[PDB]
Amino acid sequence: PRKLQDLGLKPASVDPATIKRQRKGKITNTHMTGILKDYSHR
Amino acid sequence: MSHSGAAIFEKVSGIIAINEDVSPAELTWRSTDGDKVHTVVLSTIDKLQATPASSEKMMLRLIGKVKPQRHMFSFNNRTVMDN
Amino acid sequence: DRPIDDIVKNLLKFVVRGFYGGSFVLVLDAILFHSVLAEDDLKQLLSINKTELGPLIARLRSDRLISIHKQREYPPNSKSVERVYYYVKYPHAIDAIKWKVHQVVQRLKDDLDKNSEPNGYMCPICLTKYTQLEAVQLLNFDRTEFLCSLCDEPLVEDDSGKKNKEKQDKLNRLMDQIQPIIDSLKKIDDSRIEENTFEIALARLIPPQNQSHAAYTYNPKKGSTMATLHINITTASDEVAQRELQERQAEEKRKQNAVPEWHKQSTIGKTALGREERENEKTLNDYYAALAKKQALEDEFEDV
Amino acid sequence: QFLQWCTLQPENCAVFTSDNKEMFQTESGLVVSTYSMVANTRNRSHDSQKVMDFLTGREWGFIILDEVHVVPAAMFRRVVSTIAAHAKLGLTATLVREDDKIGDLNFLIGPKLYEANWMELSQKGHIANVQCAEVWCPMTAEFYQEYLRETARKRMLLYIMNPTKFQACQFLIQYHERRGDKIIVFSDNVYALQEYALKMGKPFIYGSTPQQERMNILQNFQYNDQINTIFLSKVGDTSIDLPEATCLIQISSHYGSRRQEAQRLGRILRAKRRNDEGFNAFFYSLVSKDTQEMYYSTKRQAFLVDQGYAFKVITHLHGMENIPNLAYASPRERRELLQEVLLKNHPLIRKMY
Ligand SMILES: [Zn+2]
Ligand SMILES: [Zn+2]
């Protein structure tokens, strides 16, 4: 797939994957354990 | 292409097809060797259960209406599950 | 399906029907019909043996017509084995076919060029060829015959040039036979080929047998570094009630922003805080009738 | 804000904090830091000494002194001398101090360039139109009897924790939670903050609460509809990030701090509902009757009425007796609260050690 271009013929194949690829802290508001909800996202 | 795909039903490989043109629509399942053919009546379906893409086991569950009727569809590709 | 997929399917079918035997044709057509196959899949569909499919798999792997996937799964009986999945990488396969046919025609052209060289000689006793250049250094004192270096035998003429027209006609008979292949590559080169892989080939998968030990569900790993539409049909009668409900919602919005009673007026003078129509319709219907006579195991759950 | 509002590249910007001490390598750029970091007379670390040498050896073209009211302090004054800056801009919302050093800023920074008309900005929708109020809580007989025969420090906590203030705050929380308002309750006394929060079942945030817990409680206040009231100590007075609130209750305060009083008002002055017609935010200063809390509340409200706000007194809340649950309605509960408030106040030798 990288030597077809060296010969003028267009390859339909891209080069393969061989050539060039890549705490829990303490709580103080103990009177609402479970009333508050976790928000890891907006 | 979106209405057809490979699937496993009751630990038996098969193909899931959508008969959308007929009223009511039918989700027929054909065994590959022709041993059995399974069909689902879509009018008597209450809710659809699915598994997230993070889960390794790929399973799809159907729930019917009146002991409710339950069907289980195991798939092999996630894009087939999406369609 | 996709016409370009039809063209690549016909191209692989033509190359396996032309340059490969019938068992190779059956294997490649099984892959082109059922997209991903394992060993037991092909064995069940074709009634073929493991050593019988040996050279077939070896040739279509060496010629890159079939790629192999080394995925092992976990069946419920826990007797797992590292099965191999046979499938096709379309762009790699067509590049391999292109390279093979181009090297075939280039090697045939170079053989034709070598046949364009004059005949030369070959000593039958020693079975060694002798070109025309080295024949002159080995001619006799009589200037009449070319004698061998070792056998000292009069050289006889080879056939480099007599078969040159034969090699050219072989090239011509190769060229019209390979013409559908080059036509397919002409149509492919004018189009875009999607680089399929193991995951892409599973999209168009058709399973071959029921009790297949090969689970086609792919398992990705870590560490390897090699919406809905809903409608509100109304007969324009309940829509007035919907407008009244929106008016009620507006009233609730007004009540939400209402000024408190201790803000709108002074609290000093107050105490300190601390601890029958139906029979009528029947008569009209009877009158209308009189008039008419007058004209007459549990898993993860998702809300989908 | 520098990286967002203007075309300043991040390699031109730098931060001088405890965690971050690397400087911009370009010939010009931005440094942002803290007053205490620049004006640290203590033995600072070697890297911080290098950064301070870089700041002092560079002639700066502009210094921005955010919250300039803390500049007239002891060695916060020295930041305008240790940094050779051509232009000095002081940005603040509370240009008041309880001493006379607020007038020294014209010697430090420069003249008062622009006084913003707060009522002009409120009538144009730029800031919230708050309804400032002052709820008068009549002190009970036994609490006032204990209030007269006590020292000032104990008198403070004794007038903060009167049960009529509990009832008024509970009724206001209930009423403004029915109205769907985000309420921030301010009280500088930590013990009173905890007691009010435990009595009313609402989360509280103060100094020793962990920062992840503070962030979680702030996110719950901003997003969870069941969390509409968070109690805050003096942590909320200073410049920390807070969700938008439309109601405020001031249970206690730090003497007659006009700066703190106007800083607390600023946390409800930027509410999102300003575009809504007829929207009003609410400020409540719950103060106990016939105490020094009247004197301190009037001293605090002097700056806000200088801005032009009208603090309407509230000696009556309609529906105090009709509320379902009253905090310390029974005399025995008030007596128990009174008792509680009164009872508030050679390698081998190394194995030895
Ligand atoms: Zn490398
Ligand atoms: Zn010879």
Q: Given CB atoms, is B40 within the 8 Å cutoff of chain C?
A: no
Q: How many other CB atoms are there within 10 angstroms of residue D318's CB atom?
A: 15
Of C108, C134, C135, C132, the closest CA to residue C118 belongs to C132
User: Which residues in chain C have Cβ-Cβ distances shorter than 8 Å to A16?
Assistant: 92
One-letter amino acid identity for C71? Q
Question: Three-state SS string across C70-135, please?
Answer: CCCCCCCCCCCCCCCEEECCHHHHHHHHHHHHHHHHHHHHHHHHHHHCCCCEEECCCCEEECHHHH
Element (H, E) at D90: strand D88-91
Structure tokens at B37: 């053919």
One-letter amino acid identity for C184? S
Interface contact D220-A39, CB threshold 8 A: yes
CA C142 to chain centroid, in Å, comes to 72
User: Which residues in chain C have Cβ-Cβ distances shorter than 8 Å to A9?
Assistant: 98, 102
> Which residues are CB-neighbours of D171 under 8 A, at least 6 positions away?
D317, D319, D320, D323
Where do we find the tokens 């056939």?
Answer: C159
Interface of chain A against chain D, CB under 8 Å? 23, 25-29, 31-32, 35-39, 42
Of D206, D186, D345, the closest CA to residue D254 belongs to D186
Phi (first) and psi of residue D269, to 5 degrees: -85, -10
Are the C-beta atoms of D184 and D242 separated by less than 8 Å? yes
- Apex CA C195: angle with CA C189 and CA C199, to 5°? 155
Interface contact C273-D168, CB threshold 8 A: yes
CA distance D147 to D165: 15
> Which residues are CB-neighbours of D242 under 8 A, at least 6 positions away?
D184, D218, D236, D267
CA distance D97 to D74: 13
In b/e form, how buried is each residue of D321-334, taking b as 16+ CB within 10 angstroms? eeeeebbbbeeeeb
Where do we find the tokens 């086609």?
Answer: C216
User: Which residues in chain D have Cβ-Cβ distances shorter than 8 Å to A42?
Assistant: 223
Helices (H) and strands (E) in chain B, counts: 1, 7
CA distance D218 to D103: 37
User: Which residues in chain C have Cβ-Cβ distances shorter than 8 Å to B75?
Assistant: 217
One-letter amino acid identity for D281? A
CA distance D83 to D109: 12
Q: C271: buried, middle or exposed (CB in 10 Å: 19+, 13-18, 0-12)?
A: exposed
CA D75 to chain centroid, in Å, comes to 23
Q: Given CB atoms, is C92 within the 8 Å cutoff of chain A?
A: yes
Of D265, D254, D267, the closest CA to residue D297 belongs to D254
Phi (first) and psi of residue C76, to 5 degrees: -65, -20
Of D328, D318, D331, the closest CA to residue D162 belongs to D328
CA distance A32 to C184: 71
Are the C-beta atoms of D337 and D153 separated by less than 8 Å? no
Where do we find the tokens 């390598």?
Answer: D25
Structure tokens at C33: 């019909």
CA distances from residue C221 to B54, C71, C225, D65 in whole angstroms, order as listed: 12, 11, 10, 53
Interface contact C210-B52, CB threshold 8 A: no
Where do we find the tokens 């009538």?
Answer: D123
Looking at the CA of A20, name the nearest ligand. Answer: 1
One-letter amino acid identity for D17? T
Experimental method of this PDB entry? cryo-EM
What single DSSP character describes residue C176? H
CA distance D311 to D303: 11
CA distance D202 to D183: 11
CA distance D196 to D250: 12
Q: How many other CB atoms are there within 10 angstroms of residue C98's CB atom?
A: 22
Look at phi and psi of residue D24 and say left if phi exceeds 0, alpha if psi is from -120 to 50, else beta: beta
Interface contact A26-D210, CB threshold 8 A: yes
Rg (C-alpha) for chain B, rounded Å, is 13
CA distance C219 to chain B (A): 7
One-letter amino acid identity for C104? V
According to DSSP, the residues that pair with B49 across neighbouring strands are B61
Mutation target for C interface from A2, A13, A19, A22: give the one with most C CBs within 10 A.
A13
Interface contact C262-D276, CB threshold 8 A: no
Structure tokens at C172: 């011509």
Count of residues in chain D: 353
Q: Is the dihedral of CA C155, C161, C166, C170 positive or negative?
A: positive
Q: Given CB atoms, is C91 within the 8 Å cutoff of chain A?
A: yes
Cα diameter, chain B: 35
CA distance C139 to B7: 80
- Apex CA C252: angle with CA C249 and CA C256, to 5°? 140
What single DSSP character describes residue C275? -
Helix (H, G, I), strand (E, B) or coil at D14: strand
Cis check: omega of the bond before B24, within 30 degrees of 0: yes
> Which residues are CB-neighbours of C213 under 8 A, at least 6 positions away?
C38, C40, C75, C81, C83
> Which residues are CB-neighbours of C89 under 8 A, at least 6 positions away?
C64, C67, C195, C196, C197
Interface contact A31-D216, CB threshold 8 A: no
CA distance D137 to D333: 18
Question: Resolution, in Å, please?
Answer: 3.6
> Which residues are CB-neighbours of D32 under 8 A, at least 6 positions away?
D2, D13, D14, D15, D16
What single DSSP character describes residue D242? -
Are the C-beta atoms of C214 and C73 separated by less than 8 Å? yes
Of D10, D13, C298, the closest CA to residue B57 belongs to C298
In b/e form, how buried is each residue of D166-186, taking b as 16+ CB within 10 angstroms? bbbbbbbbbbbbebebbbbbb
Of the partner residues A9, A12, A17, the one whose CB lies closest to the CB of residue C91: A12
Are the C-beta atoms of D168 and C273 separated by less than 8 Å? yes
User: Which chains contact B through at least 3 pairs of Cβ atoms less than 8 Å apart?
Assistant: C
Mutation target for C interface from D280, D315, D332, D333: give the one with most C CBs within 10 A.
D315
Are the C-beta atoms of D312 and D304 separated by less than 8 Å? no
Helix (H, G, I), strand (E, B) or coil at C45: helix
CA distance D226 to chain A (A): 8
Chains A and C touch, contact meaning at least 3 pairs of CB atoms under 8 angstroms apart: yes
Of D252, D248, D133, D136, the closest CA to residue D187 belongs to D252
Rg (C-alpha) for chain C, rounded Å, is 43
CA distance D199 to D182: 19
Rg (C-alpha) for chain A, rounded Å, is 29
Helix (H, G, I), strand (E, B) or coil at D281: strand
> Which residues are CB-neighbours of D186 under 8 A, at least 6 positions away?
D232, D233, D236, D237, D248, D249, D250, D251, D252, D253, D264
